[PDB]
């Protein structure tokens, strides 16, 4: 028996998030990490942290 | 000298905290808050 409870507090636990191959170069709907929008995907050279 | 702090953790514990106290060791001009 599964038990699932709906309360307010940080959820931690749920599915795998299914991913799809990035389109780099291309006009594409990315939903990173979720966040979204429409724009071209390519290699930046940023030193990110 | 300025230093920024780094994020490490990010614990989604959700607990109401009030104190807070520092532990020790033991051995045979620190603990700034």
Known sequence: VLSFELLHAPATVCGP????????????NFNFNGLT????????????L | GFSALEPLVDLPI???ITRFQTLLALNRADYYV
């Open chain 1, 17 to 28: 998030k299914k991913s799809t191959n990035l389109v780099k170069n291309k006009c594409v």
């Open chain 2, 14 to 16: 959700g607990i109401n």
């Open chain 1, 37 to 48: 929008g429409t724009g071209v995907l390519t290699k930046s050279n940023k030193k990110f």
